[PDB]
Nucleic acid binder design. Structure first.
Length: 80
DNA sequence: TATGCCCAGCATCGTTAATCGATGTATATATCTGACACGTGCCTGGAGACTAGGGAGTAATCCCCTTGGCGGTTAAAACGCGGGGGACA
């Protein structure tokens, strides 16, 4: 928490938490097992996509088509 | 003397014209009532003007409450089948 008490803080947290804790990496049985890997994907927007990336953040053509439902999903659509 | 013949005589029918009166239609006049606008008079309940103060506006922060997402059971909704008893004539 505190910037300069943090050492004081983990002096209390590291010494106490460990017992009832176990931290151990794979570095085991993974030597046989074939390798792990992950790739990201940058996909840019489409045609009908912007329409509903742009119009949805307002109630322009989101209210023209399915306007009755617009109301409940309006926040649903925003950040979730 | 009785019976056909001459000379009036009012009522029968119809038609013309003047007259009192009823009906229909204007036409300018004298009431009837029902006013709505104005001036008469007066009251003050509003308008007009100024003040003083505290409500309410707004802005800045907080933190609680409302919405959300998710997944497990476990009751509830859903369905149908069947036949009885209430609706309806």
């Amino acid at each position: 928490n505190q910037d300069e008490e943090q050492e004081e803080y983990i002096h209390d947290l590291h010494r106490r938490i460990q017992p009832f804790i176990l931290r151990r990496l794979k570095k085991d049985v993974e030597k046989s097992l074939p390798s792990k890997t992950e790739r990201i994907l940058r996909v840019e927007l489409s045609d009908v996509q912007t329409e509903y990336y742009k119009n949805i953040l307002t109630k322009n053509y989101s209210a023209l088509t399915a306007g009755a439902k617009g109301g409940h999903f309006s926040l649903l659509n925003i950040m979730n």
